[PDB]
């Protein structure tokens, strides 16, 4: 996020951080419930990566975060690698997230749901803050 | 990357005014937002684009792509959860 501000700790309980055996954060994900995360297709998540929730400060050891394993990667089949059209991957967790004051589900909309232009939204993550 | 989680508010746009920018790259299952002075960026992907709808944050989009440079002028481009919730609804029934 270039030009964003630090969040309030645990105020976005659905945010996951996907990290490789290395501990490297490379993509964000979202909790739709306690057995399944949603991130992007391009991310390219494998079952050797770990889903991390409850995190706030990637660099803190004293933070009671949850490191979740991936059972199955479910890439949409309408996913268009050359286009980046339909860039949704589901992740099925081998071990259930424990819901708490800092781990919760986001709401999914209706196919029907309308979300109109000039509407003020909010995006989060642990992305380059500078280019 | 930053160590601790960041957040930015940004206005969603129509795809049309977005085409003004991204052209025929903008597809129907894709939804633009920003060009507000904030920019999603490397490492942001997979992540949440939420909106407030009748008390709750709803998953409205998924950071997917945009500027090579993360320009606060170019709108970012996210997944359009509305065009895909049908499939999500469905993987879960199944597994």
């Amino acid at each position: 996020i270039v030009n964003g501000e630090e969040a309030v700790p645990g105020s976005w309980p659905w945010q996951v951080s996907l990290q490789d055996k290395t501990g490297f954060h490379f993509c964000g994900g979202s909790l739709i419930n306690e057995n399944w995360v949603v991130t992007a297709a391009h991310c390219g998540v494998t079952t050797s990566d770990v889903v991390v929730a409850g995190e706030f400060d990637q660099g803190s050891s004293s933070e009671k975060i949850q490191k979740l394993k991936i059972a199955k990667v479910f890439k949409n089949s309408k996913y268009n690698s050359l286009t980046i059209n339909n860039d949704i991957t589901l992740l099925k967790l081998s071990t259930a997230a424990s819901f708490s004051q800092t781990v919760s589900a986001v709401c999914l909309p209706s196919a029907s749901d309308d979300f109109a232009a000039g509407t003020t939204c909010v995006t989060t993550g642990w992305g380059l803050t500078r280019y | 990357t930053p160590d601790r989680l960041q957040q930015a508010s940004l206005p969603l746009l129509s795809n049309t005014n977005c085409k003004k920018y991204w052209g025929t790259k903008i597809k129907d299952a894709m939804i633009c937002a920003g060009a507000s002075g904030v920019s999603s960026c490397m490492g942001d992907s997979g992540g949440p684009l939420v909106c407030k709808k009748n008390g709750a944050w709803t998953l409205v989009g998924i950071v997917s792509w945009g500027s090579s440079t993360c320009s606060t002028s170019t709108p970012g481009v996210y997944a359009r959860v509305t065009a895909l919730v049908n499939w999500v609804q469905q993987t879960l029934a199944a597994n």
């Binding site: 105020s11 309980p13 800092t102 589900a105 709401c107 | 944050w57 709803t58």
Partner: peptide, 10 residues
């Protein structure tokens, strides 16, 4: 869903 325990601040 979508209603956190810790309310986000902007």
């Amino acid at each position: 869903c979508g209603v956190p325990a810790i309310q986000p601040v902007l």
